[PDB]
Structure formats: C-alpha cells, structure tokens
Amino acid sequence: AMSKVLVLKSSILATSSQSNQLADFFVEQWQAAHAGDQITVRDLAAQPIPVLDGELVGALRPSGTALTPRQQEALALSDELIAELQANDVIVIAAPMYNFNIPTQLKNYFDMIARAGVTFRYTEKGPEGLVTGKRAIILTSRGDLVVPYLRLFLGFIGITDVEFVFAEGIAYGPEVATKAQADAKTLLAQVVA
C-alpha cells in the first residue's frame, strides 16, 4: 500500500492500439517495481462516457429540480469518476493524438470530471483546483498543441505534477516478440522509477 494507481485508456484501436500496448507495459513495469501498489484500469473506449450535451450539462450543476433518467445517470457517473480520481495517487493517462486533439473518449471523461465546486472552485483570488496531491503520467504520441492543453486542463483541477512520455515509435506495429516490451522498458524507466 504505497500508491494507488489509476490507468485511463482512451484509444479506439483496442488491442492493436499502440497506446494501449504501452499502457499495459507500464502496468507490468510498475507492478514489478512497486509490488504492493494497487493498480486499477478504466478503459474509456470499452466503457464509453457520454457526450456532454445540453441535457447533461444541466445535470452536472446544482439545480434542485427533478432530473431525467439520463441526467441522473450522468450525475452519478460524474460523481463516480471524480471519486475514483480523488481515491488514486498516480493517474496514468493514455492520450494518443487524433486529428490534432485528444480522443473524444478522453475528452468526454474530462467533461464529466471538470465541475465547478467539485474539482475546482472560484475563490476571491481566482480559481483553484481541488484534485490535490496527485502525480499524472501522460502516455502520448508526437508529430503539438495536445501537450500544453493537457498540462493546462490538469493544472486547472489541481494537478501540477504532470509528466509526459512520447512513444517515439515504440509498439507502433508488427514486431518480433519481446522487442516492443524491451523498448518500452527503456522508455518508461524514468516514470516507473
């Protein structure tokens, strides 16, 4: 019981995903280096988060009105995702670049967790994040506005320890066995240690 680690997968390419392969290598390496740690994984493609629309945005703010079933479900989901984030110490986010942005799968997660009065709040001296004491490790790809955006968003909710890892080709495609794993060990050595 040294750290609780939450891994967020967002790729839409399932098991052939480069970033999912990297996330799995990360998990293996973390387990080996930190035997007592509790790792959990949320796959945002396998269990999609709904799109923030007019109906759902109303569910996420204080109202006091009766809510539709889908509103109730979104509010409960948001609460669950936020509790999950707060319960973990290390947040590993697999965020491949899709059309110069993050995957929508991850964006929908962000739109559920960014809630005023819950994960940030306004004070007399500006906004402050309420998700404190976290370490975030971002597994991404490069070719880049996604990186400063991730730093800004995570910072806004209180996460300033944000560490980016760029898959410089590791686990790209067809590869003799053992090779991607070894290359990933080299890549992830810094963040795992």
Binding residues: 11, 17-19, 97-100, 141-143
Identified binder of ligand FMN from the candidate list 41, 147, 181, 192, rule CB under 6 A = 147
Asked whether position 1 contacts ligand FMN by CB under 6 A, the answer is no
Distances from the Cα of 95 to the Cαs of 46, 166, 173, in angstroms? 15, 10, 18
Q: How far apart are CA 64 and CA 53, in angstroms?
A: 19
Question: With the C-alpha atoms ordered 73, 131, 144, 16, is the resulting torsion angle positive or negative?
Answer: negative
**What binding mask, one character per residue, do residues 84-123 give for a copy of itself by CB under 8 A, x or -?**
--------------xxxxxxxx-xx-xx--x---------
Q: Give the binding range for a copy of itself (CB under 8 A) out of 52-60, 71-79, 128-136, 182-190.
A: 52-60
Binding mask 159-178 for a copy of itself (x = CB under 8 A): --------------------
Q: Nearest distance from residue 176's CB to a copy of itself, in Å?
A: 26
Q: Show contacts with a copy of itself in window 117-156 (CB under 8 A).
A: 145, 148-149, 152-153, 156
At 65, phi and psi to the nearest 5? -95, 165
Of residues 149, 186, 161, the one with CA closest to residue 22: 186
**Cα–Cα dist 37/3, whole Å:** 5
Nearer to a copy of itself, 54 or 133 (CB): 54
Helix (H, G, I), strand (E, B) or coil at 172: coil
Q: Does 1 bind a copy of itself (CB under 8 A)?
A: no
Residue 5 or 59 with smaller CB distance to ligand FMN: 59
**4-9: strand order across its sheet:** 38-43, 4-9, 90-94, 135-140, 161-166
Written as one letter, the residue type at 109 is: Y
Using CB under 6 A, list all residues that contact ligand FMN.
11, 13, 17-20, 57, 96-100, 141, 143, 147-148, 151, 164, 167, 174-176, 179
